[PDB]
Structures are given as structure tokens and as C-alpha cells.
Amino acid sequence: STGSATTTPIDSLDDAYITPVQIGTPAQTLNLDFDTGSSDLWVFSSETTASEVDGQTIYTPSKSTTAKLLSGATWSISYGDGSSSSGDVYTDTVSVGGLTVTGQAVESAKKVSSSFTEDSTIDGLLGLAFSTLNTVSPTQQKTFFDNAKASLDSPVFTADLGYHAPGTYNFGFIDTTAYTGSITYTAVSTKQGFWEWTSTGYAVGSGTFKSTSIDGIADTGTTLLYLPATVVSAYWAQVSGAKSSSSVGGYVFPCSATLPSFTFGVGSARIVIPGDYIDFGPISTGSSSCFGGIQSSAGIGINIFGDVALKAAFVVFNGATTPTLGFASK
């Protein structure tokens, strides 16, 4: 089997992407944030504290003839950005882009933190990291991909995120029309439960490539590119007036600037992030200070190849017995 679904930016900055997901019988379609940095499929629901729901579409398990309470199971997750959610668990039929999994754990939120409530466009998350990170207790649950894997034509999914435009998540096949040149595959460590890999270096604009190993994670659920402070300083030093602002929470730059590209290495291959992808616009409406899309990972504890990086590439998440990651230009 295969599946193919379009993913759409939630706003004009590409802060996140939503993908329609069918849950239950008859189908209830919710728009979920596909997150290769976590492993829980959770949704706003009829059980979510009413004051914490503001415009989201909810899953109502009592209206699904295939929903079953997973008795005694609870979940609770905290994300890197400080957001969180928790609740109980149903199993139900879940379909993405025509690919159907029966008996998928659907984690129903009883509580969500303010960041989730405030984002009316995101109805929940669909985790695509390794199932070892799943938070359901006392019986850990599998991700949608893990459950689908054996049925898929090939045990892979691909992320093809758009820059200020829709893109595609495919399951079970590689669309050879969706990228240019060849796909370069690179080793993955699953030791921390992430799609963790080692970039071979970087360049700023038309500058020379610096060969250096940068361990990090491919994370579709993180907006920006978070890299070591040395790398980030070298980038922003090429933008007149750019500076790190503790009050704003990162590097800012004059909105009048033209940003240089940023290149990262994948083996001997190179992925080029155009400068425009690094512009996250005014820090507040009407400001002439703009927020940068490359930020320091210092104090995160891990480097994160988030959407800024991933949307410059066609990315293969290869879930074969020995997983790997592939990157192609597009």
C-alpha cells in the first residue's frame, strides 16, 4: 500500500504545516501537524477542557463506531518549546492520504497548554519519530508509520515541504518526479528516538564550505534551523546590522537586508537553503527588526534541522531495519 497527502503552511511564515487525517467511522477529518521529532498521535477532542479549545476541530470518539477506549492508558508529553498536552487513549481507524491503519492509538487530549489553544489551525500532532519515544503508559504505543510499515510497498515516508506553498507527505514510495539529481543517503542513530544524523559541514552564501561534523535531528515539527553558536554567528556576521537579542529571544536582522543562502552537507552532497527561507518577518507588526530562521542550539542540547532546512530538500525517512535519511535537491 501507499499514501499521499498534501501538507499546507498554517500561515504566511511557514510556522508549521498541517495535513488532513481521517479518524474514525464515519471519518472525522482533523488537520494534524506531522512531527518527525515526536512519537504521539494526539488530538483535540470532545474530552478536551472546554476553555482550552478555541476554534480547533475535535475528535469525538463516541461518534465513531470503530473507536475503543484503551482501558487504563494515559499519556502526557512536553515538547522542546515548553508546550504540553495530556489525556487518555482510544484505538481507532486512521487514514492518511488513502493509507489506512486499523487499531491506531489516538491520544485524546484532556488538557493542552496555551500555545496549542492559541493555534486554531492545528487540531493535534501526528508523531513520526521512533516509537520508543511514545508516552502512552503503561503500554507504550506505536506510531502511525510503525503500524503501517509492514503493509507499505517500501518501509519509507518522504517529506516534501513547500516554501510559502503546499507540499507533500508520501508513505510507502519515493516519487522520482519530486526531486532533481540523486538522493544522498546518510546514517541514522535511533539511540535518542529521533531521526538523528551527522551533517558534513556548511557554507554561508558564496563562501567556502567548512567541513565539520554537525550531529542533529531531522524534525518537521520544529520551524527553524538550530545549529551550534559558532555556525550561527558565522552566518549572521554576513548580514549588516544582525545581532542576537536576549529580549526578543534570538538573532534579529534589519528587515531591509538581503539574506545570504546557507548550505549544509549531506555526505559529499550539498543542500542550499535560499536566503529568503531564513526570513521570518517583523518581530512584531510594523517593526523593522526581522526574526532570523537560523538560531543557536546552545542550551537546547541538540541541533535541529527543522522546517527551514527540510523545506529546501526532498527528504526520505527510510524505516528499513537499519534506518537512514535521504536528501535531494528539488
Curated annotation (Swiss-Prot):
Hydrolase found in the keyword field: yes
Catalytic EC class: hydrolase
Keyword Protease: yes
Disulfide links within the chain: 255-290
Active site, renumbered: 35, 199
Keyword entries, A-Z: Aspartyl protease, Disulfide bond, Hydrolase, Protease, Signal, Zymogen
Residues of the Peptidase A1 domain: 17-328
A single BP term in Gene Ontology: proteolysis
Source species, domain of life: Eukaryota
Catalytic activity: Hydrolysis of proteins with specificity similar to that of pepsin A, prefers hydrophobic residues at P1 and P1', but does not cleave 14-Ala-|-Leu-15 in the B chain of insulin or Z-Glu-Tyr. Clots milk
EC number: 3.4.23.22
One example GO MF annotation: aspartic-type endopeptidase activity
Family of this protein: Belongs to the peptidase A1 family.
Protein name (record): Endothiapepsin
Section covered of the full-length record: 90 to 419 of 419
